[model samples]
Target chain A: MKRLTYISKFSRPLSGDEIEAIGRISSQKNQQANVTGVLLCLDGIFFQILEGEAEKIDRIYERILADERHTDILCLKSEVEVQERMFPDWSMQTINLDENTDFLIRPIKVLLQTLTESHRILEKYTQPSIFKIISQGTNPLNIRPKAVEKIVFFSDIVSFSTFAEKLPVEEVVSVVNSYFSVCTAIITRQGGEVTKFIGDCVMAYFDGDCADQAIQASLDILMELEILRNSAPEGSPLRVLYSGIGLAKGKVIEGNIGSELKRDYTILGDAVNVAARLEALTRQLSQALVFSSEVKNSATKSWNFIWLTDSELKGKSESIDIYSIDNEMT
Target chain B: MKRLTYISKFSRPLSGDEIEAIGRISSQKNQQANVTGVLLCLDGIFFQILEGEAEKIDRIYERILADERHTDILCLKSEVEVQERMFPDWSMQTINLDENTDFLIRPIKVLLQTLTESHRILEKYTQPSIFKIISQGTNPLNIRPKAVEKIVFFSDIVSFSTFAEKLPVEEVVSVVNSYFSVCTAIITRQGGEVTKFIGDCVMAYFDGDCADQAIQASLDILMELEILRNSAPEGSPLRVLYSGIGLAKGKVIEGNIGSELKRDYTILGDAVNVAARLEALTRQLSQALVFSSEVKNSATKSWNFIWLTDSELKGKSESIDIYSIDNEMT
Candidate 1:
């Protein structure tokens, strides 16, 4: 017996009906082949775990490779022998957590219930960093706390509260997902981790050497968001969404925090706080992007960085220079 | 044939040595009885699940009740029929995430790996709200987006960044746990839920009718924190910890947010942001507790609320009155 896990991206966006059709066919095929697994689509990425005989696994994987729907297929875990399947009762359970949820609310609830019962969705969705860390064979407790220099990025939807007040729950969720998916794609593409999403905001960081990439990602997010906003119809929640971004560069303490019962892999320092405050400053400064002088100093890329002000961070006695860069040249 | 789950609070605080002793004895007893389960101790609460024959479970329940080390044993689930045990391989897996982790760093690493492999720790630790909702038989997707009045509370350690910079990872974890444990106890007692912990910050909410209890909890937190700080030795991390709290009262959107792939049961509204920003304002205003006038108006309990500045929240056009209630009299 063998178990395999892989993640892949869609070559193109699939419609709600198209996604459901794929789920129906995939489930039927896997059942006949006696292959048991669960599939989840998130942020245009397909994450799946398959378990069965070695020959059956090989056959299915080959077909997956030739499928036109999938691109950039990367196996996370491969052909590991297991005594038993994790989803023994499930024969290709397709968890449809995508644009198609609205059409199948009742079935979606059942799928969610099953995932909840097994705690698979909760673990994968809420604390993905743990999976990322564990897959690399790093014991989380062994990660020693250390000070490291990095570029911290913070961003959130502008007037998110107003949008929440006016929209339905489904629409609010859709808007937030669009923001998260777009930002997550850019952040990961630029070689940074989208560490945590605090409510409507996104927090991410990059290695000190990747300052240029961090800024580029920050710039790319605003431009992409504008396109998302424009493409939405008049009454859609996406049309009303806008984002403000903040970036800073400094040394931060990165490691585990919280009691023994519950711990989070996160970073904390003055830079992290400053980054959030800078994001809030965008509303007051009437600019799309706000960053500290430290970011500008470390970056090698050329830009027309406009001096905003020498703002004092909340707890600090000394003031630091602040700057802004608009999505459109002014 | 049956499964039982119970939650109990320790009668008194135990030393690290005492906790380890309990773990050893409990494991031996469970193994001899042919029982299988996992035990987790968190925030001075013991959450345990035991699976065995009906007679064995009954005998164990009596022993747990008679044990002087435990108190307030409340059964979450009792004697439910089950064909298979969740922790089938382990006779009794004791997850010792307690004060003694420092002494057994290597063992803790192994225990963490075991839990991570099964994802029991990740799901329970990171997203407990899911369990709470599911246990109550509420599907998260069915939660309607509704406008409801709530008293939102926000608090975070003052100068937390400085503490992070000065302390080792172990000390940092201890300090954060101490804060969380104390706050969680008070909030739950006051009929509130600790919605989420954002790094060093805590976000919680209460029903509109529970304003007095919420206010009382807010006041009690500061006094409890002071005792915790003063009890520590001069060089201890706990001695350096201080906290600032903020409260607001308004109608907020409470429901699910995020993509179908990942969702959070959280609230969003003007009050949520105001409460967060007010917590930040404590540094400039030189007060331990700051709140919006809305909170003051809703509460029936009497308190000395000193008028502060009328501040405008970011992205909002209207300014609201702010006030403060200091822990010590001026």
Candidate 2:
């Protein structure tokens, strides 16, 4: 029985030539140590397998730690029984980061799946490696799994009419661009992905992966906007205005949509629709913010909300209860 | 000037739909709360900005935090004054963990660059998006930038030929895979990516980004391997072995390379070569590990090491001083 082992020095990202350099050096070293194994360089980390006697391995590990070049040496697994010869021919094998797509995709899927059900359709519809399959109109990836409960959120800017009225086309573009940058930055940072940036409006998604974080991200955007708007020199034409926000949670179809050339990894169904309707309702309601019963129910106990009104939504036959956010509760 | 503000609850791995939900609900509750802003999600933490009147915004935030949809509500920043609108049209924006790639790449690059001059070259050649570049390569994605003067270590199995002769091919494969797995897990968890996996050898690079953690990871691997090998089952044919380790620190190239189809991301340059040669010397010197003067010089004053003899290296003209590891020093 032969056990394999590896020891590596801690380093940062490496170039292609550096990877090859390490490989060559390791190969030369093999002669003196009578060692044979594969050496790989991916994203700057080094991985190698060493095989031999138990005592020798222990000694080698000690030496590895003693040397300043390597740190955080790890032994993934040590098998008592043999499986097969690993790295049979090569003294070392070098693999780059690009080659590890298969490995990364699996973990990424796992992470997404664990976080949000809305992503299930997208996750299932697209192959891990060939994500472009979604645009081909074939659902081979498994779009539907177990049904999952989720919350949806929608948002849009207010006073666009006033801003457009006051500013020229060029000014509007610059202002909007800056605003979009700030908004997108905050939204994406809080565990959400921007679904679309339609003109002045922006849509974001928050699944099970980091719902709380998403909410915080939304809030941060608002705060920053307030600061950016108010901090302008006195008499500045730009005035930070309110953007209506709506939040609800329900089932929806989440998957890839659009043609191959222009594909959208997005969500569909009523949950999305309701969230959109809520964004429109901001103009009807006098308050700056509103949330459906689902959002209110799912929020942490620390939130302070005031009941608004119950009314039939545009598409829904039944009326739903809506609430306004009240900072006094905090 | 009237300001816009609102609040909503959210969870992790936020999606675009979730942002829409918040927008819709906020609109329905408060017609005036409409505003645009960004969201940020970091490690399950969320933050957002809501632009509106101070009083109205405050009330909205209060209601939002009270909701059950989220927990740990926190207000990162806010402004009472108004100026330029940040997100003029977005009522709310949501950011999730998936979006972290955009922001984290810069820091990761910096950490990697500080490791070696070679790494700096790699960073220059690679694109801005680490995730995008790494995804295209065969390497891992955990590399980062750090200050200079970090340590680098290398190690490989000793007497792999003897082990190969004694073990069957299948057995060798299993043993090596297990070993590599252990090494990879430890190194990565400590904030280091496993660059490459070669035959019976592993090489790791460490720096400020993962110096302490990498060291600990290596130590843990050594101990674990020893235990697993010693406690082999009666029928197990695998034999554990010791590895020779080497340490050296200097400028090394780190980054992405290759054409469209074939590419690699790794480390290069002379520092890496020195580390490999030193590791090889461990076997010939009858020592478990050897450290170059470079490593000793960088080590902390509290550390202790046993100096060995000076020996000529295959590629280098200078005789390198080798040192054995002292457990007490650790």
Candidate 3:
């Protein structure tokens, strides 16, 4: 097992000529040193994953940044070890910025020149870039690897049972969508990242980097839900039931995960498992919100928590302590 | 010219059967109690305007709200001495709340229902509904005016010049749409009313009741615009820019102001002129934002402002004082 070091990724919109030049320079640099990785230039941004010995990789990175050809350079992924090769072949492969189309012709002169020189690997690679640039040069925030120490909160509606029993399929869908819209709005407003929507429930993490903020957001969601239920029009079963919320705090591996086929930037670890267990405990506890003792201890401010008797969690050997958040911080 | 004194104006959402029943009851009550005005059931909301003796109007209102058939009763407008007659033909005419197609429906109901209905009877009759329910129950924040106030804010974009030059027509459309999306996000976050998007610009207002909050909201807009602009791609010429912001505090008449042919629920008064002038000063001062001295004086905290020299504004005899907002509150 080899420890993969971090390689800087660069993306920028460039013309066909610029793409070819980048491919050539990258290949030439790789040949000069024992380097193997991936280079992807598409749309207007160039995405490349460079891997090799530390000293050699550092020298190449310095030169690439100093080059006057590219502007608005953004580094997407950084400070992570790569265990497997993302791109195994070719010292340097150039894919068309828009290679998804059927008809793509490599520039004849560059192709011919590379082929004439056997030392220069000129094999054309046709693979879509994996890196997704969510925001560039907008906010000074960048995704960096750090110890995951925050609470992840996930809340989801209890299936489409209420809607299914009350309304037609189309009406049920509309009702569910309306609820989703409200949940997402509240989650994002409270500074919680909506990891994904799993079925009818909203999966949200509180305090990924900011725990106190996540807890506060969770409180807001609870309060808003109550308001929604109280003000909901009569006969709408979707508004009748309460959402089950699960909260847990622990170290978790968080970042982009997936293969070359597709990837989702998310978090996974014991904390994720704890959150699911807490959600399951909601029904037994006869409360909508359920949290572990770890989360309760981590909370700096005093909050009203109703103790639920200890119960054996599915995976844990010992019974876990659970509590329901009843009121806001005094 | 008897002055009418009343407690409040109440309206409700009612079914067609409910509307018909209310109409019959009101007409019968008018014969016995000398009540004259209007009872309108448009869409689902039931609107009734009673004008006659103050005591008689109050008696009728109590009976209306007490009715079990209507739920979610909301008092849309309330004032003393309302002059116009929403149902002038009959002592009590039951009109179905149409598909909001009748421009005169909402305002006529609001104005005649108000205790302080317009003194100029014809002028009051000429006015249309000042408020409209765009999407039923979509907005979580019920920002609709609880009571008519004196001031309203109208903000709009300057031109399509920057967008057209930088992006293709399709791209420009997307940019504009995204701009509005961000705008709506901020407006709803601040609990403000977004009337609609008129062309490229969005028309939002903060009622007199929420005037101070609206001013804070206007400042929030500056912050949001900055975030959106900074988030734009580097060298992407379609960067978001500010045009004009208008805030006027005065007894500006507001309601639906259009004909049966085509109606717009808009604001009309000296305050509207002040807002327009403030917008014009945004361009003249070479700044993205401009507001009347009235808005500046009313601000609670010190915000960034560069006082522009007074200039003769449109439809004004005296030079108006204008100040360009340099940035948002830190």
Candidate 4:
């Protein structure tokens, strides 16, 4: 029925994992509140919009003001009454600035240029206090409302956190970064990208027809990880952890999402959600690969799943068909 | 930098695949434009959130206005400058209302109850013009900003859509609904539930510990589908399509998400996405079953997944180890 929109600057920059945490938490909260909106988080500035009941908007705004993550909060547009909500589908969309570090400011500028014209509508209406403060800002893109078919890949380093927690931070970082290095190298060649990392886990995406590339690339990474483990001294952090992988194919909304002071590339829709859930399945099943049937149809090669079970996921009432990889089971 | 959020209703009900189409397109565009926000679609209404430069926001708004799919533009909140994003991590999250036809409305009501105290904060806020109109509406709980681990299962019938498209609409519906009946009966009995259906694809979930239940359930559904086909009348449509199943285990963030006229339960994070991807792999990989390593570990029973290959999935920069089960392929 109405909307509340605003912009602010964060006190500091956010790390990738922190941004991920914020992404999950904020998304969870908005869905619960029945409030939909978007957040534009730059290095030092934050911009956000919320649409819902006038009251819901106010409560979230006031609470946001009290949040410890940011300060110098300036309320530009306090409240407004309108006929309809503008960005209803989005709960809190996000965009990144210079995630491609060391490349060049031009990379960020290129990203900025890729923004659709619709992104600039408000610039004609007014400017914000933080806009002046955020001279280094790049236009942060948000996930718009639309879905497309994609193949989502999820990987979890087996017992990584548990193993790393006991090791020195350098060893942990060294092991993780190296794994990432190996992963990135292989994935890029295979026609995909590692989009995000959650501690020991990494998420990736490939176009619908690229399942074969995904399968091979993953194989290489694991093969390489195995090689490193076999060749390493017992003390090497790589020796203590393995990797589990999951894949799913279906429609996912690929875009940026965020909240008060966080955001980045993420996907929305059931397919992506199932992919993540499948990744978690690796541990319970004692296998490294799990997936849904859609992937089987789209993949270049058949991965005879272990035919695990038909079960329901968290958000739905209907059960789905599911399967697991066989030989990997312990 | 600034943000914009609003809500509107679609002029007509969208097909499930069509709804998914909008999600990916809009989400991809927003991210490319460096805009971020949410979209909430009630049965007939749409709610969206966008954040970025005022110019960028306006540009996107104008483009959306030109979208022929929806109209009756209502500006709820316009040109208000604020500091801080309302929802940080949510992208174009979505939720559905009447998806649980045979499932009790009490389940919806029960889910509604899970909203935290903060959910009550804006209850007194003035309701929107469409709130009452939507009362008789299916309450599509939206994806919120939070994190939770979940098990995801996805199912797809083989070559069903191609056959259904050739058959009468009523025949398609009848055959599909019958399949759904079989799926639900078995899934419910196995400590799981069927959540949503996208086209012919069914999505479901099991808890972290429910591996055995999932495996057995899939077998039952497929076995049952087989029986149905065998017992079907010679002319029955059930003979046309077969079912391929997929399963994966992983952590996921379950939440609510939507637009003004559209919203429902959504899964955030990557685990679920991969599950769906894995499902798709079944068709291409020529397997009836597949899974990620995580599922293998979590399973209560040892399902010796045919150690097929260490494949990389699409989205991940790293590789996911894989497994499979199939009589068709070695």
Candidate 5:
């Protein structure tokens, strides 16, 4: 059996009676899939850990992913293999949490928490994925073996919250799901894994020469998002669907860095920071696709590169050269 | 079969290795008793929901109540018969929450969240009985006997944070646990059920001669805390454990309140506010125990009533008649 944990939010408050009815329906569906786990709600936000066969969890998660009751479905930890299930006894246990409970749970667990304090509820907001994690608690340990070479990719949806607030909740959900659905299909198909979908950003990783794949999958997202934008009623929350894509290749750690309580397995070196800085530059530099000098050197395919300029990242005294992709040849 | 849900916390952070060791031991022990459940950790707080026969859950809960690895074991929900077990398929499953994950679970579940954010890490804390269910969360829709008249109680440990900051973590744990132990024993024996242990305060409820019972419990706790205070070494962190107890008698709605998402089974009227206000008043008046005229009229035993003053609670325009218990006799 495999386990996957994810978070989603409902558009409105669900009555206990509604939660109970959903509970009963979920139990039957879970039983059919041989899946068992707990479903907890705080306000409208959902944090669930589902465990079952590989296909079972995947199938159920997809159905849940497409469900319209909630939007901004962020997959926190997907496909984590465990020796056993964490909630084997529960087949969709529902828990409602108080909105002010930011203090009760651990800092990391705070993300799954419905932060009544944040403007995150206002859909179009651009949020810092890692910063949200950091601000809640201590720095997590990102261990190494760690920093075996990894191709890290980052993307950010421009002006996400702009029209997010103006649209019907369903329209927002539809507009984004369509963007994510087709993009994710292409991402994994290229042998890269999506690590997290935070706010208006999706972070992913690849093990080998996948810069082209990351770039192409991103290009597919741009085009797909355009289709979604056009399909939106002449008046909808589809203001702009363009985003910045950043990629960098470097050594990464596979295990915990400081302690097990704060665990991470992702890119661990300067490359990660460089890649991240470039993504941040998208908002500052007005660029759609950004890559590092390392990416320029490693690319097996021909790509036109424009020297955007050297950029200095915080905590780094020495500046490094940065550039944006100008064009690509298939 | 029956099921039990409880919360316990570690005195200190447990390493992954330590948690795994405890997990394995718990599994073997649970297997022996024919019990199954999940164990989760956020910082040092532990929440577990166990399932088994009446005898099975009791035996294990008793053992857990004494385990040395953690202290401040508060049973959130215990021994409710089920047509089936919520976790019959799994043994002991362990999860360590990143201290940063305030976001993973719902907000209402947040209150039940182990508040690692507090100096609660100082450990030794005496917990209350199962009566706090007359408390927060939905009457949970867990179980009910319709509506019942219950005397709600509240208390606050005076000068709790003063020395709480001065002591060694272990000593605080030791000091608090010592106090929680014998005093909780007395409260339960006297027909008062302890509901929740918040910070240094213990809240409880009673149905029989509740005014006197609540008063006596406070009297017992003050005396018990004195012993713990005196037992501390000259250099120890034990400062003062004196507390203020408040009581109000009223009709209450039973079963989880509102919806399951926002479950609360406590006094759903003015009495709850009255009790809480009186407890807050204890600090203002520097009194040991305070009760409403409602409690004063219901007491079957004799007590010294010190008319401190009529108190006005927040959000209320009318002042309430309140009194302090000067001395008690059974």
Candidate 6:
């Protein structure tokens, strides 16, 4: 993978519609090429970043340079090999700066005014989310809480506190990193969004239709943990690594929450509560996989789910059916 | 309020016990003086940050200058007045970095090697938590999940999405800021920790013994909201600002959770789930203040506790008693 950042001045000032049209076409092209990045048009100058395969970005850059709409195109920064994309979610996202007093955009405007070409300086001052948020033109009001059906998944390391206490700090971080790395990989593979990780607990959710996929991810995670244990060196703590998972499917509020000083794009609501409760129950039940009936019913895959219990959960009024699946079946 | 950052070279190497004794004594004295900061002892050099009233910090710095244990003292950064303390939880926390391969500390060591006195360079390169975390020498292992009794509080703006939809982004930000500012002030004043703000929602908690105080804060928050509405100009968005609050007392797991890349010092448990549910129920109940039976039982303060319902909240199997207090009574 490679990343390319560039700046160019327009040959002539473009209208808002013209600029948006260019953005739309560029976005289409970038998406088709599996390219992702951001484009900011400020004061008749264009600042852009492209992330993709080296050949793809190079080809895109060549075309960009040949365009007659812009001139004096200069590459700001280019890395032949990069660890990750800065704008992973964008596909040629474009923002045209105008004389507007947008609280989020104004500071970005001031920042880009002096450092449009200085990638290092820009990175030094701002986090990547700032650019993504501005490019998306997202505001607090725009992202107010709205209910969305999702497969809320929760998982945590078993006896993590006891194990962590006996180890050094570095080992604890390593074990945690390994666990997160594996679960995150499997979750992402199954089209799940890995959300919060509270201590050893992992909070994730899948879109409503991805029930089978979410289930598959949960099972795969347990299998991967077993593999990790088997592969560890003799007498290693990794040998004892294990986790329990819970899943629920229902409406959850997807929104940005927190103060202006700090915030998170997170999910909350009833589904979240139920999923967490089910995860906690795994300890008492001695089951590695536990989920609510909603999750079991929503799934298309015929997993060997056995009836666990119709138990009451904390704060909940009526008993709900709980189900669990055998890890060995996977 | 003021913040003072300084560095001083030690006259001689100090043993682990000696350094800890100094830290213990400094922490005790700082706590008494209502001071908070971090102290780092690196390679016979001491770097410290002190935050408090201007007079208090100045007095501490004067005493430090008179100490015979250190030499070549230099003030790296000093702000006469600051918005808030960077290490609000610490009171002269100290770390002595020996030849250890601590993953979290190594990066800090490298960054400070050449920029010991360059406050700008340090601020530019690192966040405030890195210093606090290292000063306390807290590794991931030390903060494993632990259950602690707490009074969980959750609150969110009512119909915020509808009200914000018609407003511009700036106004949306202003209103959101005002809500957080007001809630945060009252929460902090009542000895509660504002854990998170989810869009219009606020998550906070107090110590187990602070149930009465938490209830008081909730009532005060409603009263303050009314005052804000009355003081607002005609047709102002602030005039219509209102929030729903929920309180529950129980055992919550307080610990660090997230991937190695990003994590949060947060709380999660049955109490957290219940409090959030009660807050959501506020809209249905048409009550600004709603609390679980546990909170009502734990509170010693006499207030009008009206039984609202034996409501079955979304995850729980048995209905729990819900109570509400009239905002007008405050």
Worst 10 residues of 6 chain B by lDDT: B118-127
State candidate 3's TM-score: 0.30
lDDT for A114 in candidate 1 is 36
Global lDDT scores for all candidate models:
0.71, 0.51, 0.51, 0.57, 0.58, 0.71
lDDT tens readout by residue for model 4, A1-330: 456545455556777667657667777888888877666554555556667877777787788898777765644333456667555676765544445333222222222222211122222211222222222222223214345678888887775545433655434555655665677667767878655544456667888888777767766777777788889886666676577777888765544332111123345445666887877776676557677777666665666556666344664335656665454332
Better of 3 and 6 by DockQ: 6
Off by over 4 Å in 2: A1-148, A161-181, A184-190, A208-215, A232-241, A259-262, A310-312, A328-330, B1-330
Superposition error at A22 for model 2 (Å):
7.5
Across B1-330, the per-residue lDDT of candidate 2 in tens digits comes to 134222223454555566557656765555456555444333433445566666777677677777665664423123457776655655544444334453213222222212222111222222223423332322233233222443566757656545545655445444555666666666656766555433456666777344345446656666766777788787664445566667677655453222121123445445666877887776666556566766665655444567776666776656777655567222
Native contacts recovered by candidate 5, as a share? 0.01
Superior by lDDT: candidate 4 or candidate 6: 6
Q: Candidate 2's residue-wise lDDT over A1-330, tens digit each? A: 245443243455556776677678767765445455565433334545555444554564456557554454544334334445444455555544434454223222222211222121122222222322322323323343223355666777676645655655445544555665676667656656565444356666677444456456656666776787788778654566567776667754444332111123444445666777877787886765666777766666565568876544876646878776665211
DockQ of 6: 0.05
lDDT by residue for model 3 over A87-168, one digit each (tens)? Answer: 4565665655354332111221121121112101100010001122211111111243234666777776664454554555
Where does candidate 2 chain A have its weakest 10-residue lDDT segment? A113-122
Scanning candidate 5 chain A in windows of ten residues, the lowest lDDT window is A256-265
> What C-alpha lDDT, on a 0 to 100 scale, does residue B116 get in candidate 2?
22
- lDDT of candidate 4 over B20-134, digit per residue (tens): 7887887788777667666654455565656776788888889888887886554434434656654454444443333524222222222222111111211111122222222
> Can you tell me which runs of candidate 1 are displaced by over 4 Å?
A1-116, A168-170, A284-287, A300-330, B1-116, B141-144, B165-173, B259-262, B284-287, B300-330
Model 1: colliding residue pairs: none
What is the DockQ score, from 0 to 1, of model 3? 0.01
- Model 3 chain A: weakest 10-residue lDDT segment is A119-128
Q: Estimate, for each residue in A129-240, the C-alpha lDDT of model 6 and write its tens digit.
A: 3333433324322556566799999998887765655766556656776788788788878888776665567888899988899889988888888888999999888999
Better of 1 and 3 by lDDT: 1
Question: Which segments of candidate 6 are over 4 A away from where they belong?
Answer: A1-141, A168-174, A309-319, B1-181, B187-257, B265-330
lDDT of 1 at B68: 95
Error of 4 at B158 (Å): 1.5
List candidate 3 segments past 4 Å from native: A1-133, A137-147, A328-330, B1-330
